[PDB]
UniProtKB/Swiss-Prot annotation, chain C:
Phosphodiesterase (PDE) that catalyzes the hydrolysis of cyclic diguanylate (c-di-GMP) to 5'-pGpG. Cannot use cyclic AMP or cyclic GMP. Part of the RocSAR two-component regulatory signaling system (also known as the SadARS system), which regulates biofilm maturation, type III secretion and expression of the cup fimbrial-gene cluster. Negatively regulates the expression of cup genes by antagonizing the activity of RocA1. Disruption phenotype: Disruption of the gene results in biofilms with an altered mature structure but does not confer defects in growth or early biofilm formation, swimming or twitching motility. Contains an N-terminal phosphoreceiver (REC) domain and a C-terminal EAL domain that possesses c-di-GMP specific phosphodiesterase activity. The EAL domain contains a functional active site loop (loop 6), which plays crucial roles in stabilizing the overall protein structure and participating in catalysis, and also controls c-di-GMP and Mg(2+) ion binding. The response regulatory domain is involved in interaction with the Hpt domain of RocS1. This is Cyclic di-GMP phosphodiesterase RocR. Changing E352D: 30000-fold decrease in kcat. Changing D296A: 33.5-fold decrease in kcat. The lineage of its organism: Bacteria, Pseudomonadati, Pseudomonadota, Gammaproteobacteria, Pseudomonadales. The keyword rRNA processing does not apply. It comes from Pseudomonas aeruginosa (strain ATCC 15692 / DSM 22644 / CIP 104116 / JCM 14847 / LMG 12228 / 1C / PRS 101 / PAO1). The modification 4-aspartylphosphate is found at D56.
Length: 380, 371, 392, 389
């Protein structure tokens, strides 16, 4: 009311029947393409397209490449498939449409039953938690921004470094945390993609900080799956070069858990980064069995313990004992320890009493976007 | 007749001008060693070492060094990783006078060893891996229905090698993807010739399970098919039943795109789980294949025959093809025909061949059929 | 949000520890732990509700799925998370199978078990909590103790289900099936006791009670000139005892019965999961001359190869195969392959769960020959069964 | 390339089936399956040689590392393949730890087994078949059963001492076989088997009453040295343990406080809650409790609402690693810090040279065991040792 449908249908009689069925039910314009090249030109100059329709059973490798064109244009919202999808590959097909960053509206067979074209229109406008399609589009569209949380010294004011955190400017929900997209990115293998957007932003921020005479070390989280990648280390350097920042300006964090399930060849990237001089933190330390055995076998330059140690100090003396033990450990290996989630002064002094040097939490600073951080940094 | 580059820099070099008979070059950094071109590179790898990590890197794709002694005895804790890191560049790793001990080791370096990681990375980089082709044939008559594309290494000293001598390496070092694209385009080229000889014959490529998780496998396959002006159905992709079991969660995206494109999809080593019949049901493979042990155990085991029968019925009821592997003799060829099998691979027809042998096999076979 | 309730089923103490440690950090509420069926059913019995069960679908020490089935009958469980992110092709089928139990599928946990991922699944749960069916403590799921006393008070009766030819309904044999004459709940099928008996090693006790009620009946049939063989289910655990085959033979002799008058049935999963030492009893029953049937068949072929000679005279197709015929027609191809298999081995095929005549005709069309199900005859107590066995 | 014997250890029957199915297609030889230890050991005894053991170090109903240790001593096993690619950082330690047993490590299998990866490991095996071995009389199951049924096991005692001085604090009670033919044997030659055939408990009640006889002597003498007895996880099962321990202490006129129980970290981790209730019961009774073999990490601390341990003991390997693995010194430091902050004692084991006695002092360690001070002794020697002090 009024919609804008684009049908891709090669076979001319089929085209004829389809479009004619669409006139009856579809309030609004309708466009027509006899192949990929003609459809990609209807795109090359048109506004929004509410629904794209094409036939994946009949063709085939054209239909797929089209949908990508549909995807790349940024101009299409939803998809109806003009053949019935096989029950056994239903979810496969939907998921495939959604990794294009298109919404799957539905499917139906030629010649179209008119009641079925209504069902899907009603359903469509009825769409007026984020979906897979949403995440992919958000990512293909530079909506993801880097946030910054400082690692400060507990005693004094301090400013030692920062953890780069992923946030998403949602056009309707606003700023969101990883739990609302990492699932999707994790499941569909977009983590790498997000990583490189953020790593670039992060280095740009690192430059502005070097321009300002600030030794703020920027720490990035690396997903274990990336650790298996052939050229991660070689790509991190190429960018560190392109940006004229030195290795040591920068640090990569990997959880203890994720390090457990990491791919056979993870070490090839890890020796790289270590030699290079990049700092390497083992994050959420104390999560597996052999935590102490791990530090032994890999020269991590930092250890981080998480929100729960701090919270548990007061009510649970065993936490204090392990905080102290860890302090000793970092102390004896000559590396840094960051204690996360400090929210109160009580907590802060206790940590000092125990021996901890670095912290993060809402006491000092919540995660911040580039500018608020830069301002924060101009001040210590 | 012996080359040394190295990169206190004077202690080892007078200790070298006392040892190595030949041409001794030298440089202070990457840039100056990269110019020092116009056999052995000794290396300090607590250079820490991005400069310590520019050097070896041109060196490797330059084809300008073969072997690497480090100028430092690194911390045993990441000695393995560091060795993997060298070798992964395609450079051989000798070690850390113990000095002269390894310089005559490899100036000399007979039942000889399995290839090193470095060996395999090199061969991969220097076009030494070649597609071979084994025909799928109509048991009744003499094919020719298709061909499987296999990987062999034209190793410079050892001759032709089967995957046992390189695939572990590539799997552990995430190099299988790189081999696949090499052999895939080789196979597409052969498929052109095959059309050009009037023999449209489907070619099947084995896909490694890890590859199915890769973001744009199917689309690349798609682009490449367009480049070679070949239709999707001239090509097939085979994945082992167990491989599919261990496959990444994203795998179905690639499989559905291939199916939708119209390439064939074969489930290879059918029956190796655990859920075999259930799995066939949930995905529409156009072909399943039996391991060669099924045909071998046909004399001893009435059971082997039974499962062949069962699978023959399974494929005919799904309207898909069945390939039986391991056909080594004529008596097992006729037994297979009683059982209702139709397509086969095996030594009786042809072991895997390099392109030209395969083409000549094809010509001959066509000529035989026409009489 | 509140006292979330999470039960983790994990066999392997180091995975359990990793998982539990991660859950403690992030889950608001209690984390419960089970290493085996016994802990798991105990935890279930004492709990009022279990909001999320985290389950590993292949364990050595526990059948995860069987616990889920039992759990679904309890009323107490909202949702399931799987800790094996396995098998892409079979993933939908695995989901639906969970969903047909009553259960809600939340997602899979990775074998990392990343804290971020965990909170996603919790937010996800928490957004569904209301829309989910109420948790009630169903009193119809007899407790372990309660099962244990029934089994000590002679209230388990043998029922008999005929196996018949598909064209006609001519009698061929029958399976003996366990029913519980529950003092106050009525007559219960295996859904209501078998899983408990399996988990507390009480199956062997049930088998000896039913096996002799059955031989009694087989004796009466012989006397009637009715050559109907009776088939008894042997659970894999029972194969544990080196003397099973010898105990079975002493008992057959005691009842004046030849081995050929009887058959034993083991599931495919059971046969697969048994140590070779244990598989030696089947070889023995086979040599004695008993029939042997491999039960709930249909999954693949690798069970054919466990033993030097295939000891089985019969194969039975899993009940679900008839239901899937319309629902998923590719399953007709498996029925065909299994028909072809049985014929090639020269053994018989039974197809179970035949309820309508439209199924009967299709099964005949596929080449099936012997069948069990509601369409022909319900499980009967002895006298109804005996009377049924007068009509040819 | 033929007549191999391959042993597959696999807990989980579908995984075992897949592996065995793959193995039969490709191995020229025999494929032997073991679903547990009871089966692994039996296959071991009948076998005479096993070319390759395929083994999962992370199983539920079988300890894969234990079995490999036992196989290593039998000298019947050449190579190992691991059925998991687990843990890239800890991989080199794992390989070394295996090679230190005297087994050649071949590689990992992807734990749904590929055919071409099997024949690869096969070609690797063949290449390495004639390599130089390494390192010894292993008694059989039958032998252990009769040995045990015939009172051949004796209690030995190892003092726990102050690292400076040599002051006596306590003693661990140890097991030794007084074997009719091959002499005095340590647990390396019997415990694994007892562990896997449900015989440990029987060994325990013998040595416990032997140890009680010795404590009671010490107590009549007014020499209060607590004796620590190792408890195996399986025994935590029987809910009667503590009643039975309490009843013996009574029979011997001793209080709970005179005695201590030791349990390994991995033992503690492997245990159902139903079992840890038993540990608590001993602690409520007033027995001492130690966690043996400590130092992997911190996860053990959080299994019970109350930590029931008064003592923590590091493994021999730590003293040993001090040189060839300097980083481990940090962990000792760390454990010292832990133990101290917890207000419990820390025992370091396997101290040989006074050189390494000095470093432990630096690091902060106080209590110890090892050959520097006193080697395990039979009753009477130990009774005299104590008399000195
Ligand atoms: Mg982090
Ligand atoms: Mg193949
Ligand atoms: Mg049955
Ligand atoms: Mg001890």
């Amino acid at each position: 009311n009024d919609l804008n449908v684009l049908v891709l249908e090669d076979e001319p009689f089929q085209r004829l029947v389809a479009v004619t069925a669409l006139k009856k039910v579809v309030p609004g314009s309708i466009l027509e393409a006899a192949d990929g090249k003609e459809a990609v030109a209807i795109l090359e100059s048109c506004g929004h397209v509410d629904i794209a329709i094409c036939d994946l059973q009949m063709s085939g490798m054209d239909g797929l490449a089209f949908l990508r064109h549909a995807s790349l244009s940024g101009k299409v919202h939803s998809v109806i498939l003009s053949s019935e999808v096989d029950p056994i590959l239903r979810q496969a097909t939907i998921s495939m449409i959604e990794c294009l960053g298109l919404n799957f509206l539905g499917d139906l067979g030629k010649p179209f039953s008119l009641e079925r074209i209504t069902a899907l229109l009603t359903r469509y406008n009825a769409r007026r938690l984020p979906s897979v399609a949403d995440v992919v589009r958000g990512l293909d569209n530079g909506e993801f921004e880097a946030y910054y949380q400082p690692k400060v010294a507990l005693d004094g004011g301090g400013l030692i470094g920062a953890e780069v955190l992923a946030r998403w400017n949602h056009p309707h929900l606003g700023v969101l945390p990883p739990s609302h997209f990492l699932y999707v990115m994790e499941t569909y293998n977009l983590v790498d993609k997000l990583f490189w957007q953020l790593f670039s932003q992060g280095l740009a921020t690192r430059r502005k900080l070097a321009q300002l005479g600030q030794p703020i070390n920027l720490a990035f989280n690396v997903h274990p799956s990336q650790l298996g990648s052939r050229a991660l280390a070689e790509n991190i350097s190429a960018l560190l070069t392109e940006f004229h920042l030195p290795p040591s300006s920068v640090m990569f964090e990997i959880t203890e858990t994720g390090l457990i399930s990491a791919p056979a060849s993870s070490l090839e990237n890890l020796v790289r980064l270590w030699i290079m001089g990049c700092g390497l933190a083992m994050d959420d330390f104390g999560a597996g069995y052999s935590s102490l055995d791990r530090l032994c076998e890999f020269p991590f330059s930092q250890i981080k313990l998480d929100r729960t140690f701090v919270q548990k100090m007061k009510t649970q003396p065993r936490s204090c004992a392990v905080i102290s033990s860890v302090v000793a450990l970092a102390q004896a290996l000559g590396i840094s320890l960051v204690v996360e989630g400090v929210e109160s002064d009580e907590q802060r002094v206790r940590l000092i009493e125990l021996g901890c040097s670095i912290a993060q939490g809402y006491l000092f600073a919540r995660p911040m976007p580039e500018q608020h951080f830069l301002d924060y940094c101009s001040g210590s």
